[PDB]
Scaffold this active site. Structure first.
Site, PDB file in Angstrom:
ATOM      1  N   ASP A  59     -60.918 -29.650 -26.335  1.00  0.00           N
ATOM      2  CA  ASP A  59     -59.516 -29.170 -26.383  1.00  0.00           C
ATOM      3  C   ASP A  59     -59.132 -28.266 -25.523  1.00  0.00           C
ATOM      4  O   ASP A  59     -58.857 -27.220 -26.131  1.00  0.00           O
ATOM      5  CB  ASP A  59     -59.177 -29.057 -27.827  1.00  0.00           C
ATOM      6  CG  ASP A  59     -57.674 -29.104 -28.084  1.00  0.00           C
ATOM      7  OD1 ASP A  59     -56.857 -29.752 -27.070  1.00  0.00           O
ATOM      8  OD2 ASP A  59     -57.257 -28.965 -29.349  1.00  0.00           O
ATOM      9  N   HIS A  62     -54.327 -30.756 -26.180  1.00  0.00           N
ATOM     10  CA  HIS A  62     -53.478 -31.246 -26.984  1.00  0.00           C
ATOM     11  C   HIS A  62     -51.970 -30.790 -26.899  1.00  0.00           C
ATOM     12  O   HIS A  62     -51.095 -31.557 -27.388  1.00  0.00           O
ATOM     13  CB  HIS A  62     -53.764 -31.655 -28.448  1.00  0.00           C
ATOM     14  CG  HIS A  62     -53.399 -30.341 -29.266  1.00  0.00           C
ATOM     15  ND1 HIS A  62     -54.459 -29.184 -29.548  1.00  0.00           N
ATOM     16  CD2 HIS A  62     -52.612 -30.027 -29.893  1.00  0.00           C
ATOM     17  CE1 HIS A  62     -53.901 -28.237 -30.429  1.00  0.00           C
ATOM     18  NE2 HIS A  62     -52.725 -28.876 -30.736  1.00  0.00           N
ATOM     19  N   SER A  99     -50.738 -23.449 -31.411  1.00  0.00           N
ATOM     20  CA  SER A  99     -51.822 -24.300 -30.745  1.00  0.00           C
ATOM     21  C   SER A  99     -51.682 -23.875 -29.224  1.00  0.00           C
ATOM     22  O   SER A  99     -50.729 -23.646 -28.604  1.00  0.00           O
ATOM     23  CB  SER A  99     -51.275 -25.865 -30.598  1.00  0.00           C
ATOM     24  OG  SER A  99     -51.578 -26.492 -31.781  1.00  0.00           O
ATOM     25  N   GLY A 100     -52.982 -23.564 -28.512  1.00  0.00           N
ATOM     26  CA  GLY A 100     -53.164 -23.324 -27.302  1.00  0.00           C
ATOM     27  C   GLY A 100     -53.291 -21.894 -27.131  1.00  0.00           C
ATOM     28  O   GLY A 100     -53.678 -21.599 -25.996  1.00  0.00           O
ATOM     29  N   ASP A 127     -54.587 -17.640 -41.384  1.00  0.00           N
ATOM     30  CA  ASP A 127     -54.652 -18.742 -40.492  1.00  0.00           C
ATOM     31  C   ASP A 127     -53.585 -19.000 -39.374  1.00  0.00           C
ATOM     32  O   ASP A 127     -52.629 -18.304 -39.311  1.00  0.00           O
ATOM     33  CB  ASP A 127     -54.620 -20.122 -41.341  1.00  0.00           C
ATOM     34  CG  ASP A 127     -55.435 -21.245 -40.386  1.00  0.00           C
ATOM     35  OD1 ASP A 127     -55.964 -20.871 -39.611  1.00  0.00           O
ATOM     36  OD2 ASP A 127     -55.369 -22.489 -41.311  1.00  0.00           O
ATOM     37  N   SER A 128     -53.823 -19.430 -38.299  1.00  0.00           N
ATOM     38  CA  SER A 128     -53.044 -19.939 -37.302  1.00  0.00           C
ATOM     39  C   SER A 128     -52.611 -21.320 -37.772  1.00  0.00           C
ATOM     40  O   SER A 128     -52.872 -22.032 -38.777  1.00  0.00           O
ATOM     41  CB  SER A 128     -53.737 -20.265 -36.041  1.00  0.00           C
ATOM     42  OG  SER A 128     -54.607 -20.992 -35.777  1.00  0.00           O
ATOM     43  N   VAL A 138     -34.248 -14.398 -27.000  1.00  0.00           N
ATOM     44  CA  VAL A 138     -33.781 -13.137 -26.404  1.00  0.00           C
ATOM     45  C   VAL A 138     -34.463 -12.860 -25.161  1.00  0.00           C
ATOM     46  O   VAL A 138     -35.562 -12.442 -25.282  1.00  0.00           O
ATOM     47  CB  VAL A 138     -33.443 -12.144 -27.649  1.00  0.00           C
ATOM     48  CG1 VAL A 138     -32.711 -11.075 -26.778  1.00  0.00           C
ATOM     49  CG2 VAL A 138     -33.052 -12.643 -28.592  1.00  0.00           C
ATOM     50  N   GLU A 155     -43.226 -12.423 -22.913  1.00  0.00           N
ATOM     51  CA  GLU A 155     -42.526 -12.662 -24.160  1.00  0.00           C
ATOM     52  C   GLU A 155     -42.688 -11.624 -25.289  1.00  0.00           C
ATOM     53  O   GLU A 155     -43.835 -11.703 -25.550  1.00  0.00           O
ATOM     54  CB  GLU A 155     -42.529 -13.928 -24.453  1.00  0.00           C
ATOM     55  CG  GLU A 155     -41.808 -14.863 -23.408  1.00  0.00           C
ATOM     56  CD  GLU A 155     -40.335 -14.970 -23.714  1.00  0.00           C
ATOM     57  OE1 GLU A 155     -39.930 -14.013 -24.261  1.00  0.00           O
ATOM     58  OE2 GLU A 155     -39.656 -15.742 -23.051  1.00  0.00           O
ATOM     59  N   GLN A 213     -49.373 -24.900 -36.663  1.00  0.00           N
ATOM     60  CA  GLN A 213     -48.663 -25.477 -35.675  1.00  0.00           C
ATOM     61  C   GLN A 213     -47.730 -24.771 -34.963  1.00  0.00           C
ATOM     62  O   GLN A 213     -46.972 -23.888 -35.622  1.00  0.00           O
ATOM     63  CB  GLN A 213     -48.095 -26.767 -36.258  1.00  0.00           C
ATOM     64  CG  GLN A 213     -48.698 -28.150 -35.866  1.00  0.00           C
ATOM     65  CD  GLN A 213     -48.674 -28.328 -34.362  1.00  0.00           C
ATOM     66  OE1 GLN A 213     -47.433 -28.455 -33.833  1.00  0.00           O
ATOM     67  NE2 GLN A 213     -49.652 -28.337 -33.574  1.00  0.00           N
ATOM     68  N   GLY A 214     -47.747 -24.676 -33.723  1.00  0.00           N
ATOM     69  CA  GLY A 214     -46.801 -23.780 -32.918  1.00  0.00           C
ATOM     70  C   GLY A 214     -47.814 -22.884 -32.407  1.00  0.00           C
ATOM     71  O   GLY A 214     -47.475 -22.292 -31.244  1.00  0.00           O
ATOM     72  N   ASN A 222     -39.788 -11.652 -28.223  1.00  0.00           N
ATOM     73  CA  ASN A 222     -38.715 -12.442 -29.200  1.00  0.00           C
ATOM     74  C   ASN A 222     -38.379 -13.553 -27.995  1.00  0.00           C
ATOM     75  O   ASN A 222     -37.784 -13.466 -26.877  1.00  0.00           O
ATOM     76  CB  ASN A 222     -37.350 -11.751 -29.196  1.00  0.00           C
ATOM     77  CG  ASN A 222     -36.450 -12.540 -30.121  1.00  0.00           C
ATOM     78  OD1 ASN A 222     -36.542 -13.715 -30.055  1.00  0.00           O
ATOM     79  ND2 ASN A 222     -36.167 -11.872 -31.244  1.00  0.00           N
TER      80      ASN A 222
END
Length: 223
Positions: free
Chosen positions: A84, A40, A177-178, A171-172, A57, A52, A174-175, A54
């Site tokens: 998914d 998705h 995801s994956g 919880d995890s 930056v 990564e 949105q953002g 930050n």
């Protein structure tokens, strides 16, 4: 990630950010050439960002590498989120180091109660919106299949599992995801979906990576 903690820079060295002009999803490096993420999260023009912390930056350990191809699972159903999972190939191999490292794939499923590490740059609020700049982490146990299916009747397939807390608050989001769910040193899950974030009796739902290892290995070997 709601209810988690700041991981620490490069403490999750297999975590990647998928960028299309902005961060939009997580992923996991599985070898120097390949990332696994959620179907998705598919879009064209993905740049993979490794090393990564930050995401806003340049701190000096990043590698930014364009995707050369993306492969969505043949059976991905966007209506149910069954299957998914997607693979992303890097145009040039990542340079592996202490801050950019691959995560091993599982040979078998993990048992209920096993502790896992979930990470990402998603929203940190359960009702409002606040997006972090540094990577966030959550320790969460695999939940029994019965508690998972009880929370989401008619919606959980054998290619999904739940992890987290029925009491809510962690919880995890949105953002995220994956991104990865890592247990006992193996990539067991991919952040997939849920009922909002950190609600009661609605834990996070994750793609069950062990069901896909044959497909992952065959697909990367042929591409």
């Amino acid at each position: 990630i709601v209810g988690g903690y700041t991981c620490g820079a490069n403490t999750v060295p297999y975590q990647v950010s998928l960028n299309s002009g902005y961060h939009f999803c997580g992923g996991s490096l599985i070898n120097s050439q390949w990332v696994v993420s959620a179907a998705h999260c598919y879009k064209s023009g993905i740049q993979v960002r490794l090393g990564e912390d930050n995401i806003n930056v340049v701190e000096g350990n990043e590698q930014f590498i364009s995707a050369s191809k993306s492969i969505v699972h043949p059976s991905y159903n966007s209506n149910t989120l069954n299957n998914d999972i997607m693979l992303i190939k890097l145009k040039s191999a990542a340079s592996l180091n202490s801050r950019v490292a691959s995560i091993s794939l599982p040979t078998s499923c993990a048992s209920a109660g096993t502790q896992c590490l979930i990470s990402g740059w998603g929203n940190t609020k359960s009702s409002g919106t606040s997006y972090p700049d540094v990577l966030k982490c959550l320790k969460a146990p695999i939940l029994s299949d019965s508690s998972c299916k009880s929370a989401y009747p008619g919606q959980i397939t054998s290619n999904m599992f739940c992890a987290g807390y029925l009491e809510g608050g962690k919880d995890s989001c949105q953002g995220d995801s994956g991104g990865p769910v890592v247990c006992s040193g193996k990539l067991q899950g991919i952040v997939s979906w849920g009922s909002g974030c950190a609600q009661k009796n609605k834990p996070g739902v994750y793609t069950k990576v062990c069901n896909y290892v044959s497909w992952i290995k065959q697909t990367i070997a042929s591409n």
